Amino acid sequence: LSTAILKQKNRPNRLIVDEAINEDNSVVSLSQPKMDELQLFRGDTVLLKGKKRREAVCIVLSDDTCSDEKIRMNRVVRNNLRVRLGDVISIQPCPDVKYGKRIHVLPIDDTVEGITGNLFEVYLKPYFLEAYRPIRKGDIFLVRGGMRAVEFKVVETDPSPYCIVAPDTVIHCEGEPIKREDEEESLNEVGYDDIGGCRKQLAQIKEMVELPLRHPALFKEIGVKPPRGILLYGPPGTGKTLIARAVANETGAFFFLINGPEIMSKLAGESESNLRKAFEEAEKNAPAIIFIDELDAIAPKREKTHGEVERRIVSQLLTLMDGLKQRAHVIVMAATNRPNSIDPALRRFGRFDREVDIGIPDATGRLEILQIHTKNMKLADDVDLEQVANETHGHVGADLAALCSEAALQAIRKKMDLIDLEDETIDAEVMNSLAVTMDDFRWALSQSNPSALRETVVEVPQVTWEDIGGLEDVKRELQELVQYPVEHPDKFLKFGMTPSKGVLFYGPPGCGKTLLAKAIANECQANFISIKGPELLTMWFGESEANVREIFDKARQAAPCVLFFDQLDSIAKARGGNIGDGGGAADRVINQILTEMDGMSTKKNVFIIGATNRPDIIDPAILRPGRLDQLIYIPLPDEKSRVAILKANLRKSPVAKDVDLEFLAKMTNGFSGADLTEICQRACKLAIRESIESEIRRERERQPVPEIRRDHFEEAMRFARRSVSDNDIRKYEMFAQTLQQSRGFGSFRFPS
Amino acid sequence: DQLDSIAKARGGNIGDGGGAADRVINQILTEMDGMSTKKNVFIIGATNRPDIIDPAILRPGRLDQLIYIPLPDEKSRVAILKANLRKSPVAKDVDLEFLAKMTNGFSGADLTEICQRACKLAIRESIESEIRRERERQPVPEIRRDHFEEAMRFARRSVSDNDIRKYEMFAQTLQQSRGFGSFRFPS
Ligand SMILES: Nc1ncnc2c1ncn2[C@@H]1O[C@H](COP(=O)(O)OP(=O)(O)OP(=O)(O)O)[C@@H](O)[C@H]1O
Numbered sequence: 001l002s003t004a005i006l007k008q009k010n011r012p013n014r015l016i017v018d019e020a021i022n023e024d025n026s027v028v029s030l031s032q033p034k035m036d037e038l039q040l041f042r043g044d045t046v047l048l049k050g051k052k053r054r055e056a057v058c059i060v061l062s063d064d065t066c067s068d069e070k071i072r073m074n075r076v077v078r079n080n081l082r083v084r085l086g087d088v089i090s091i092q093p094c095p096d097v098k099y100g101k102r103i104h105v106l107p108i109d110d111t112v113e114g115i116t117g118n119l120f121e122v123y124l125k126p127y128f129l130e131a132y133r134p135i136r137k138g139d140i141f142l143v144r145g146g147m148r149a150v151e152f153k154v155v156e157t158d159p160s161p162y163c164i165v166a167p168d169t170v171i172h173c174e175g176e177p178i179k180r181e182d183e184e185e186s187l188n189e190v191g192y193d194d195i196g197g198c199r200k201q202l203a204q205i206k207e208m209v210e211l212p213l214r215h216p217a218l219f220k221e222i223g224v225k226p227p228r229g230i231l232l233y234g235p236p237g238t239g240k241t242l243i244a245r246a247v248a249n250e251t252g253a254f255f256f257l258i259n260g261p262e263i264m265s266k267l268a269g270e271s272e273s274n275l276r277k278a279f280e281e282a283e284k285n286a287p288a289i290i291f292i293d294e295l296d297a298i299a300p301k302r303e304k305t306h307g308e309v310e311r312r313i314v315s316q317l318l319t320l321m322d323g324l325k326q327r328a329h330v331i332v333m334a335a336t337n338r339p340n341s342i343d344p345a346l347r348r349f350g351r352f353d354r355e356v357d358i359g360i361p362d363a364t365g366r367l368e369i370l371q372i373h374t375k376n377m378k379l380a381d382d383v384d385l386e387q388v389a390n391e392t393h394g395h396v397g398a399d400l401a402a403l404c405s406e407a408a409l410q411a412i413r414k415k416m417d418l419i420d421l422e423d424e425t426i427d428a429e430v431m432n433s434l435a436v437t438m439d440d441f442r443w444a445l446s447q448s449n450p451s452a453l454r455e456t457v458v459e460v461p462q463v464t465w466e467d468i469g470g471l472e473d474v475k476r477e478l479q480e481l482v483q484y485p486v487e488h489p490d491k492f493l494k495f496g497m498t499p500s501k502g503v504l505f506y507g508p509p510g511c512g513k514t515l516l517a518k519a520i521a522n523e524c525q526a527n528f529i530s531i532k533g534p535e536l537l538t539m540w541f542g543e544s545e546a547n548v549r550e551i552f553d554k555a556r557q558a559a560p561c562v563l564f565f566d567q568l569d570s571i572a573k574a575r576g577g578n579i580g581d582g583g584g585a586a587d588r589v590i591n592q593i594l595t596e597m598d599g600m601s602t603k604k605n606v607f608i609i610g611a612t613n614r615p616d617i618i619d620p621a622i623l624r625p626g627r628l629d630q631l632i633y634i635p636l637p638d639e640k641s642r643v644a645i646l647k648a649n650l651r652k653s654p655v656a657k658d659v660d661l662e663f664l665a666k667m668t669n670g671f672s673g674a675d676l677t678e679i680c681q682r683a684c685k686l687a688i689r690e691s692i693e694s695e696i697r698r699e700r701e702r703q704p705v706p707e708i709r710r711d712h713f714e715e716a717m718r719f720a721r722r723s724v725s726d727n728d729i730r731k732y733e734m735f736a737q738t739l740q741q742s743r744g745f746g747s748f749r750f751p752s
Numbered sequence: 753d754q755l756d757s758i759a760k761a762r763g764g765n766i767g768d769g770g771g772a773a774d775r776v777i778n779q780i781l782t783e784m785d786g787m788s789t790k791k792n793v794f795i796i797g798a799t800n801r802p803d804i805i806d807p808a809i810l811r812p813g814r815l816d817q818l819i820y821i822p823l824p825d826e827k828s829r830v831a832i833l834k835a836n837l838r839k840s841p842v843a844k845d846v847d848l849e850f851l852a853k854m855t856n857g858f859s860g861a862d863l864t865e866i867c868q869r870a871c872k873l874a875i876r877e878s879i880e881s882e883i884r885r886e887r888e889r890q891p892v893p894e895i896r897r898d899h900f901e902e903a904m905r906f907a908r909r910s911v912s913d914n915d916i917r918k919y920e921m922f923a924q925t926l927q928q929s930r931g932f933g934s935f936r937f938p939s
């Protein structure tokens with residue numbers, strides 16, 4: 001019942017907006033049973049209320065084709081109401097409307113440029129002649145006529161705001177021309193419906209701000225003071241400032257904007273006086289809303305601040321919020337990236353009473369954000385927004401906006417070829433043909449990366465599941481590790497068990513441990529963070545452990561995310577190794593990771609994968625189920641596997657049919673995966689050597705090798721050698737034996 | 753959560769960082785039990801390896817109770833399996849009592865792994881089954897016994913017998929110096 005406030009409810013006044021048939025800018029049509037329900041007569045003047053606090057007046061008529069639940073209204077009033085077809089409006093009778101005494105109108109520049117004749121005679125008088133048009137202060141209405149229609153705005157009325165344009169009502173159009181920029185900016189103002197995925201957060205913010213202002217009698221009856229401070233926190237791009245703008249636009253209360261840095265002043269006492277002036281102005285126009293952005297910069301902790309100016313600024317803000325003189329009807333909103341950096345005294349009651357967490361949207365939230373951002377763009381029928389929403393695993397609202405913008409830019413880049421790119425004008429046909437398609441969104445998805453993880457980005461060599469030869473059972477567990485919890489979450493809820501998200505790769509060098517991680521980076525539908533082992537460690541005392549939390553929090557923020565620790569033995573050690581180990585910092589890095597993988601915090605869809613050459617030196621606590629659940633042995637490839645490895649390496653290469661890969665696999669009894677790749681790499685170099693030597697001969701006489709041949713492999717083999725010795729293998733075969741001999745050595749079967 | 757990190761033996765590493773690690777132990781020492789009056793603040797810590805713990809931290813008045821949480825016996829292994837599956841629909845025919853007897857050195861985390869792996873095998877069949885239905889059109893209500901059977905063959909005990917003995921050795925030293933074993937007042 002937290003979002004019981006959002007439910008628009010079923011009301012007679014709420015009318016679905018639909019197109020009009022014969023109505024002009026001052027009349028609307030309704031169904032006769034609806035007038036019988038609302039007790040309206042044909043010809044009554046009415047109030048129509050739109051989003052972002054817009055209002056209109058028209059004349060209500062009867063339409064026999066009108067659905068009872070819909071209202072007919074033309075494009076002019078729809079733009080006046082900031083309402084599109086399918087939305088809802090509120091309708092109520094408009095009494096006591098008097099004939100206008102004087103109305104002031106002004107044209108729109110983009111509709112009037114090139115029109116030099118008398119605007120009044122050509123446009124206004126025929127439009128208003130004997131019509132008695134009801135208009136409001138601020139209406140935007142279109143008048144046809146002459147060479148081009150000229151758009152008009154009402155700026156002043158007598159009386160205000162509602163009048164009937166009678167024949168005697170003097171109409172004048174002299175004044176300063178209106179700028180197109182103001183009209184377009186008003187159109188593109190942000191509303192509540194612009195927010196996406198913050199339904200719970202929007203519920204909370206609405207309860208704090210909108211409800212007390214609209215219905216003070218309720219809080220007076222229950223006899224409590226509603227919360228007067230809201231703190232919005234979360235990762236960047238979640239919509240904190242956007243929610244601020246939406247609240248500012250959709251409230252009939254004074255809004256003041258404060259930016260943490262811009263309040264500062266070198267001269268002593270002027271920043272405190274700036275804060276005092278802002279709060280004095282807000283109290284002057286009470287009720288008022290104050291938004292302080294980047295509150296961390298203005299208001300850090302007083303205890304850990306050496307600057308006197310910063311401490312006194314925090315104290316001044318603290319006193320303004322909850323001093324002796326309680327602020328009457330001022331709601332202070334604040335937004336910050338790091339709520340912990342804020343002075344704890346500010347996070348009290350009476351000062352930012354209810355902190356609101358703007359989080360990363362889920363699959364449904366990102367679909368809503370995509371629909372919001374793509375409404376202004378033209379989409380082909382093939383475009384699927386559900387698929388794109390499902391693909392953007394770690395994306396935040398700003399990331400989704402960047403994705404939409406990148407798809408739009410790619411559409412123009414596709415239309416690049418036709419135009420010369422330097423013509424004075426572009427031909428109208430190619431402009432009309434330009435439209436975004438699904439392939440543009442797919443390209444943007446390939447290019448787009450979450451803003452949170454722009455640091456942990458590495459270019460990967462584009463390895464696909466086919467490029468890995470053998471390891472079929474190792475592969476199958478690897479799709480199922482990531483796909484099952486993300487693609488079928490409901491199944492785990494059904495059977496009631498959490499997924500197992502830990503995997504460790506151990507084996508002899510060069511057998512495919514790193515290559516599998518490259519495959520996961522591309523094929524798996526989840527964010528990928530690649531971590532080298534010693535990259536976390538830092539010479540400072542607390543930095544090495546802090547970097548561990550930063551990496552794990554990035555994965556939690558952008559879940560589902562695969563956290564791959566290459567050479568995990570560098571990070572993870574048996575603990576208690578040497579007296580001098582950088583002061584025990586490596587021993588202390590272990591204890592920080594053990595809490596991140598499995599600690600007193602809720603589990604997220606973070607998949608920790610680690611590859612190590614020597615796995616016996618790993619801390620036993622790391623190998624525990626719940627941290628690294630599965631221990632997969634990546635052994636030296638067998639003759640069946642070696643057959644596939646040769647195919648995978650030479651698939652792109654043109655190789656003669658005379659060569660058989662089966663004989664290659666049979667001869668190499670103990671070669672690793674890298675050894676077989678070096679054999680194929682050596683074959684090209686000899687083929688390269690022969691090919692260039694041939695062309696130089698052919699060029700010399702003036703002044704061949706289409707495919708890799710059998711004698712190249714025979715020549716390349718004699719340089720090849722086995723990378724991993726038997727004594728190295730026995731170490732790895734020994735560790736797997738301990739795991740098998742521990743349990744599962746005897747097949748386990750239930751009794752009949 | 754990991755008390756051996758913040759509270760380690762002093763003097764083990766000479767020149768450890770700036771010496772800050774040893775001074776933090778001193779700060780914890782005074783805060784837990786010092787000249788100030790003690791409120792109702794209960795300090796609870798967990799550590800994998802308690803041998804590196806500073807003996808001062810272990811002194812009564814600071815973590816006075818040293819609770820040893822050993823590997824579950826057979827009776828606990830039944831409870832651990834039931835506790836994991838209390839919200840999980842399982843077949844009646846599967847007997848959790850047998851599973852406890854087969855596993856001997858399995859941890860509570862290891863037992864959950866068998867149950868979790870059993871769930872993933874069932875989910876694999878359910879996905880494949882619903883794929884087959886789509887092919888013919890154009891399943892697994894509860895966890896079955898064969899799902900646990902295939903899960904167990906991948907299972908393995910995480911704590912080695914050597915890793916156990918480092919804990920019995922620490923536990924025994926407490927009991928070795930605990931006194932004359934059982935204690936009865938004269939008469
Ligand atoms: N199964 C395989 N299929 C295809 N290529 C393979 C396979 N195994 C190894 N390779 C080749 O081995 C090389 C590197 O292997 P990879 O990086 O996966 O090994 P690693 O054992 O994880 O690494 P390292 O031991 O060198 O730290 C690449 O040339 C890759 O093509």
Ligand SMILES: Nc1ncnc2c1ncn2[C@@H]1O[C@H](COP(=O)(O)OP(=O)(O)O)[C@@H](O)[C@H]1O
Nearest residue numbers: 194195196236237238239240241242397398401
């Ligand atoms: N929930 C959302 N719905 C619609 N658009 C969003 C949402 N969240 C973010 N955006 C888009 O991303 C941008 C977010 O930037 P903003 O939230 O102002 O940054 P910050 O959170 O650091 O103040 C906005 O310009 C908006 O267009």
Ligand SMILES: [Mg+2]
Nearest residue numbers: 513514566611
């Ligand atoms: Mg490697």
